[PDB]
Design a protein around this ligand. Structure first.
Ligand code: PLM
Ligand code: PLM
Ligand code: FE
Ligand code: FE
Ligand code: FE
Ligand code: FE
Ligand code: MN3
Ligand code: MN3
Lengths: 285, 285
């Protein structure tokens, strides 16, 4: 359907818009290129491992690789809906968001290829709770926006994508990676990538907070909606976290070898702390 | 609707895919930031001009500013459709395409603001032919892809966007800018931006060629469709070019002042040469 006019011909960009400022920061802090990461030491580390130790790291990489790919495809409807509402500054920022996610997909796929498991199908480490979030609830909530861009729909979309998938699972995943392999001195390439990813992610979560708050600010009843949608998803979050935990406890050999006391109680409490923390970044009033 | 699996969990990125290679080049050659361009000399140039000379440059800037904004919003459906067909490498590349266009919007809006015409509504320089292409035919052809992603639809979308708007109008616009203000020694900032834009644009046109050719390669009858859609739009292309030409001929004062012999016959023939050239980049066989 037609354009009825253009903001940068009638006027200019709104230079003070928060999403314009986030867009500017994204350009400044988003220069990194996964193609420049040296994975040669990672390949050696990985080949040095025994079959049992090799397996230990694959579940987390499988969750991240699919997750990056899901959110690369699934952010498009949000960019469309805000574009249709004429929110030009949001759209400019969302171009950096999508390009960040493309690079994240690229990074993990390069690591898989370099250590020699590209040919392996890592879908085996996706349980029913993971599928419910990433194969189903995420794409349902985003695609909805094509036909329903009400405040309710936009809140639910940002909640699932930015507050749960990024704000709870991704963040806890980054913490988990450092706690385990950074201590072990393993996989320097991959951890360089995790550091870059974790930096991009801060802007992604800030877009979600901004999006949810600006809708809550019009009607403080949407706040209840936010909390409700957070709680609906919690069972699948913790059901994926318990499942990974259980794989971790059964496959002890990497941890013994590298003298890592892998505190799964602490990882679990970090996930719980992330979830409650995101809730607190939205003010009812 | 659900994801039924993920390519970078089952396998890897297709590293040899042409769109993966274009994506890599885009990251390498796409570091430029419109926020780093120094427009201070442009502001002085523009204030130095008389009212008559000031006006001379505004029509081309109005066409570009709206055009950048249209294609930023209107590329989203192409990214969606190729994503739904599972063409991951195309999508990765299209994230760079969208981000390039965001920066193009940004660049012209910064120039308008810096020279002191942000508050002016430049819609006056969009005639009926321009509106037909940018306010109507472009968004119709792209949005169609949400409900119709047939080869016919995808060809028509790439033809209008990449071969006509970018491959014919944008390219001729870049040539026109250099021919006029680069000679005059005017607007150094803006011409730095035009150089960066013209570089990005090469990748954008290459995506269109690739997209159209890969569909022609399955069925050489789609070739006729391509040519037909090119010809349907030509009248509006030349009707916008004649209209700009006529504004240019009526408002002679910038050209006299700077000893520019502005050959509108040559600019017209460059537009015609662009259009025929794009046709030739698609092989029937
Ligand atoms: C043993 C403690 C378990 C910790 C939880 C691990 C979470 C795995 C993360 C998989 C999803 C990644 C989401 C990426 C989203 C994005 O790129 O914005
Ligand atoms: C006097 C000769 C006239 C020459 C033709 C001028 C064309 C003006 C261009 C306006 C549309 C710009 C399209 C931008 C598309 C993109 O950024 O990919
Ligand atoms: Fe993210
Ligand atoms: Fe369960
Ligand atoms: Fe372009
Ligand atoms: Fe006419
Ligand atoms: Mn990511
Ligand atoms: Mn452009």
């Amino acid at each position: 359907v037609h354009h009825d006019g253009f903001q940068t011909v009638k006027a200019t960009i709104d230079w003070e818009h928060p999403m314009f400022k986030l867009y500017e920061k994204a350009k400044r802090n988003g220069k990194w290129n996964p193609a420049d990461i040296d994975f040669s030491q990672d390949q050696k580390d990985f080949a040095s491992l025994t079959s049992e130790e090799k397996i230990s790291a694959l579940p987390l990489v499988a969750g991240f690789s699919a997750g990056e790919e899901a959110v690369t495809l699934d952010i498009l409807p949000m960019a469309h809906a805000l574009a249709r509402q004429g929110r030009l500054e949001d759209v400019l920022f969302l171009t950096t968001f999508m390009h960040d996610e493309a690079k994240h997909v690229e990074m993990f796929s390069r690591w898989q290829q370099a250590v020699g498991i590209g040919q392996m199908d890592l879908s085996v480490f996706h349980n029913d709770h993971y599928k419910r979030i990433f194969y189903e609830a995420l794409p349902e909530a985003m695609n909805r926006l094509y036909a329903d861009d009400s405040p309710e729909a936009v809140i639910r979309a940002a909640t699932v994508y930015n507050m749960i998938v990024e704000g709870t699972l991704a963040e806890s995943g980054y913490y988990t990676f450092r706690q385990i392999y950074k201590k072990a001195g393993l996989f320097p390439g991959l951890l360089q990538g995790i550091d870059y990813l974790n930096m991009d992610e801060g802007r992604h979560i800030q877009f979600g907070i901004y999006t949810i708050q600006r809708i809550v600010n019009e009607d403080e009843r949407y706040y209840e909606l936010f909390i409700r949608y957070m709680d609906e998803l919690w069972p699948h979050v913790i059901g994926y976290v318990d499942y990974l935990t259980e794989l971790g406890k059964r496959q002890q050999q990497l941890a013994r070898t590298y003298a890592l006391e892998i505190d799964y109680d602490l990882l679990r409490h970090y996930v719980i702390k992330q979830f409650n923390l995101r809730k607190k970044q939205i003010s009812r009033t």
